[PDB]
Amino acid sequence: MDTEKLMKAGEIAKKVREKAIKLARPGMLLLELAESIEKMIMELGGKPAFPVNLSINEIAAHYTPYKGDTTVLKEGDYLKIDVGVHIDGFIADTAVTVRVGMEEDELMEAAKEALNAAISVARAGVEIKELGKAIENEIRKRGFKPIVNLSGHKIERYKLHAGISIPNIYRPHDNYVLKEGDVFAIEPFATIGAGQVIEVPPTLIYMYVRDVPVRVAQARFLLAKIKREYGTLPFAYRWLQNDMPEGQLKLALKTLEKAGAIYGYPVLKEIRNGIVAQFEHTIIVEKDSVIVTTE
């Protein structure tokens, strides 16, 4: 495997990471904000893997803007920036919780420590759950609320949640062995609000899933065009918003939705508005160590 190249995926992913970071300042209208990042990734020719996430405050994830959006950050807005890019399949995912204009509060430390821990413990030839453990402990340590459902994942070429969910918990069933080539993105999310996250309207991101011969004209055309340019990875309403008469469009893939050619990730919301702490890094287990493609 060409982990070598893969790494680049994270390096750019970093380059963006770092930059995307400083720009997270009140007055930064997510829309512009995002875009900024996105094509900045494009600047290196880094192929994105999904759109730039900006869930913040109590919304877990799955929020990239669409044009028509505004939302300029307010200070302390516990912003979440999640970057994803790959290079012909070879993915990369790194995420940061950002307290807008302010400091690394205790919440921030936690999730970051979390990551840390898992890495420390991280070594090919381990039971996932041991990571899982590490994690919770760093959160019960700082006394907080991890998120149950929303956890890290194994990835494969061209496949985001290609599998094995490194939970932010020691689930005594994650008796799975990490090995040389196994590669995961450890996504530690925390909060204060109970511990879950929920599906939430709207959905700005969808992704192809299967060809179901369509009946409505430009629908076929959409899933066809969607197919062409995107394939398996996700995209936003924003991504298509520059392609037709607005409603006609939503409607379109919406029709496409139900037929089943694509799925649409809504948003997740910290079940009870708990501050969505969130930090992410992708690695690869090898043996005694592992490596951070997203430094």
XYZ file of C-alpha atoms in Angstrom:
295
model
C 0.000 0.000 0.000
C 1.068 3.595 -0.813
C 0.688 5.043 2.651
C 3.486 7.320 1.530
C 1.189 9.248 -0.794
C -1.613 8.818 1.680
C 0.435 10.732 4.160
C 0.541 13.665 1.804
C -3.231 13.566 1.960
C -2.873 14.395 5.677
C -0.042 16.852 5.196
C -2.116 19.009 2.907
C -5.016 18.208 5.203
C -2.769 19.718 7.811
C -1.753 22.661 5.739
C -5.409 23.481 5.390
C -6.056 22.499 8.992
C -3.630 25.109 10.324
C -4.845 27.779 7.965
C -8.574 27.022 8.298
C -7.855 27.481 11.975
C -6.734 31.026 11.921
C -9.600 32.549 10.092
C -11.996 31.186 12.654
C -12.637 34.685 13.954
C -15.991 36.443 14.503
C -16.936 38.140 11.279
C -16.100 34.969 9.482
C -19.250 33.948 7.761
C -19.039 30.177 7.667
C -19.982 30.190 4.034
C -17.048 32.267 2.831
C -15.051 30.752 5.633
C -15.635 27.213 4.401
C -15.185 27.958 0.719
C -11.966 29.614 1.659
C -10.708 26.419 3.140
C -12.131 24.175 0.460
C -10.398 25.720 -2.500
C -7.358 26.309 -0.385
C -7.247 22.537 -0.292
C -7.790 22.739 -4.032
C -4.765 25.022 -3.998
C -2.462 22.054 -3.582
C -4.634 19.922 -5.786
C -5.755 18.074 -2.718
C -8.892 16.234 -3.593
C -11.423 16.669 -0.820
C -13.113 13.564 0.576
C -16.227 15.237 1.851
C -17.077 18.762 2.645
C -15.500 20.884 5.302
C -17.373 20.529 8.548
C -18.401 23.405 10.687
C -20.778 21.957 13.208
C -20.469 24.110 16.308
C -21.655 24.601 19.881
C -24.195 21.748 20.158
C -24.377 20.355 16.687
C -22.192 17.305 16.409
C -21.306 17.226 12.747
C -22.567 17.153 9.209
C -22.840 20.865 8.491
C -21.076 22.529 5.581
C -22.756 25.670 4.345
C -24.824 26.208 1.241
C -25.011 29.584 -0.449
C -27.716 31.609 1.177
C -26.165 30.821 4.557
C -24.631 33.573 6.726
C -23.709 32.652 10.260
C -20.715 34.710 11.187
C -19.082 33.198 14.214
C -19.528 34.867 17.589
C -16.562 34.771 19.969
C -16.218 31.661 22.098
C -18.445 29.953 19.544
C -17.151 26.468 20.133
C -16.546 26.004 16.438
C -15.772 22.722 14.862
C -13.644 22.542 11.772
C -13.182 19.090 10.196
C -11.072 18.670 7.093
C -11.201 15.792 4.710
C -9.157 15.159 1.632
C -7.742 12.189 -0.085
C -5.803 11.657 -3.171
C -7.277 9.072 -5.496
C -8.826 7.045 -2.705
C -6.099 7.729 -0.173
C -8.056 9.686 2.339
C -7.194 11.888 5.297
C -9.354 13.260 8.111
C -8.424 15.721 10.830
C -10.604 17.805 13.092
C -10.401 20.519 15.639
C -12.713 22.152 18.122
C -12.054 25.867 18.130
C -13.240 28.283 20.728
C -13.694 31.248 18.440
C -11.358 34.138 19.347
C -10.703 32.664 22.771
C -8.765 30.059 24.653
C -8.375 26.307 24.881
C -10.925 25.736 27.580
C -11.054 22.564 29.669
C -13.452 20.969 27.215
C -10.931 21.440 24.381
C -8.062 19.904 26.400
C -10.147 16.783 27.092
C -10.941 15.815 23.494
C -7.390 16.630 22.495
C -6.033 14.590 25.417
C -8.390 11.880 24.295
C -6.833 11.707 20.893
C -3.395 11.769 22.543
C -4.138 8.907 24.770
C -5.481 6.659 22.010
C -2.372 7.346 20.053
C -0.140 6.593 22.934
C -1.905 3.294 23.412
C -2.194 2.930 19.655
C -0.086 0.087 18.305
C -0.801 -2.603 15.747
C -1.895 -5.670 17.546
C -4.402 -4.192 20.000
C -8.014 -4.585 20.944
C -9.881 -1.513 19.818
C -11.716 -1.314 23.080
C -8.475 -0.511 24.769
C -8.372 2.657 22.812
C -12.057 3.011 23.574
C -11.216 2.837 27.232
C -8.331 5.309 27.224
C -10.661 7.770 25.712
C -13.567 7.673 28.152
C -11.132 7.936 31.011
C -9.609 11.121 29.741
C -13.152 12.437 29.573
C -14.386 11.185 32.919
C -10.957 12.452 34.077
C -11.736 16.026 33.132
C -15.275 15.030 34.102
C -17.235 15.443 30.895
C -19.527 13.779 28.455
C -18.193 11.692 25.612
C -20.538 10.864 22.845
C -21.777 7.311 22.593
C -22.864 6.846 18.983
C -20.564 9.286 17.246
C -17.161 7.740 17.175
C -14.040 7.321 15.080
C -13.769 4.929 12.172
C -11.646 2.771 10.024
C -11.280 4.043 6.478
C -10.200 2.301 3.274
C -9.380 3.582 -0.148
C -12.243 5.722 -1.349
C -14.385 4.768 1.638
C -15.086 7.161 4.500
C -16.689 5.044 7.188
C -15.154 1.962 5.641
C -15.796 0.277 8.965
C -14.653 -0.386 12.504
C -15.916 2.404 14.667
C -13.329 3.258 17.290
C -15.927 4.220 19.872
C -15.273 6.989 22.387
C -15.901 4.122 24.859
C -14.577 0.829 26.102
C -17.214 -1.405 24.626
C -16.040 -4.961 25.662
C -17.001 -6.246 22.236
C -14.446 -4.173 20.321
C -12.144 -7.171 20.605
C -10.643 -6.266 17.249
C -6.983 -6.299 16.337
C -5.293 -3.290 14.807
C -2.598 -4.363 12.324
C -0.014 -3.075 9.907
C -2.077 -1.254 7.248
C -5.169 -0.911 9.326
C -5.747 2.774 9.279
C -8.148 4.775 11.340
C -9.309 8.231 12.082
C -9.763 8.704 15.780
C -12.643 11.131 16.218
C -13.108 12.000 19.905
C -16.206 13.973 20.646
C -17.316 15.081 24.041
C -19.885 17.394 25.584
C -21.644 17.993 28.875
C -25.161 17.137 27.706
C -25.902 13.471 28.641
C -23.969 11.767 25.845
C -25.853 11.337 22.609
C -26.326 13.013 19.343
C -29.330 13.134 17.125
C -30.298 13.334 13.422
C -31.352 16.898 12.646
C -33.009 18.757 9.716
C -31.712 20.005 7.220
C -29.357 17.805 5.315
C -26.880 19.646 3.191
C -24.844 16.639 2.382
C -25.776 13.543 0.520
C -23.803 10.893 -1.241
C -24.410 8.386 -3.998
C -25.313 4.879 -3.011
C -26.600 2.927 -6.002
C -28.018 3.293 -9.475
C -31.783 2.916 -9.478
C -32.975 3.649 -13.054
C -34.782 6.943 -12.636
C -38.041 8.019 -14.194
C -37.869 11.786 -13.824
C -35.741 13.443 -16.550
C -32.882 15.572 -15.054
C -32.870 13.331 -11.991
C -31.122 10.629 -14.019
C -29.032 13.472 -15.202
C -28.275 14.572 -11.785
C -27.350 11.129 -10.355
C -25.498 10.603 -13.543
C -23.501 13.907 -13.158
C -23.201 13.327 -9.473
C -21.864 9.885 -10.336
C -19.397 11.208 -12.794
C -17.800 13.934 -10.761
C -18.186 12.577 -7.237
C -18.694 8.926 -6.903
C -18.692 7.441 -3.414
C -17.601 10.461 -1.314
C -20.162 13.094 -0.142
C -21.062 16.628 -1.176
C -23.350 19.531 -0.339
C -26.370 21.349 -1.666
C -23.841 24.104 -2.049
C -21.870 21.837 -4.398
C -24.759 21.591 -6.729
C -26.410 24.981 -5.985
C -24.647 26.463 -9.060
C -26.294 24.048 -11.483
C -30.014 24.746 -11.963
C -33.230 26.657 -10.849
C -32.911 26.205 -7.078
C -36.006 24.394 -5.873
C -36.132 22.365 -9.042
C -32.776 21.098 -7.861
C -33.441 20.289 -4.222
C -36.492 18.586 -5.457
C -34.440 16.749 -7.952
C -31.977 14.737 -5.930
C -34.697 14.715 -3.259
C -36.636 12.531 -5.710
C -33.351 10.784 -6.318
C -33.111 10.340 -2.577
C -36.183 8.259 -2.084
C -35.609 6.142 -5.139
C -32.511 5.345 -3.191
C -29.679 6.455 -5.399
C -28.260 8.569 -2.605
C -28.388 9.060 1.125
C -28.594 12.369 2.946
C -26.743 12.959 6.217
C -28.784 15.499 8.132
C -27.062 17.007 11.084
C -26.358 15.682 14.465
C -27.138 17.714 17.486
C -25.778 17.080 20.919
C -29.046 15.550 22.095
C -29.338 18.290 24.689
C -27.254 21.217 23.391
C -24.118 20.021 25.167
C -21.049 21.594 23.738
C -19.900 19.361 20.995
C -16.214 18.971 21.834
C -14.585 17.174 18.870
C -11.034 16.305 17.791
C -9.777 14.022 15.021
C -6.663 12.419 13.601
C -6.000 9.616 11.211
C -3.251 7.086 11.603
C -2.005 3.763 10.596
C -0.993 0.984 12.913
C 2.202 -0.782 12.128
C 3.629 -2.370 15.236
C 5.230 -0.692 18.256
C 4.026 2.550 16.791
C 1.633 4.120 14.373
C 1.714 7.359 12.473
C -0.192 10.624 12.323
C -0.830 11.579 8.735
C -2.491 14.614 10.245
C 0.488 15.397 12.582
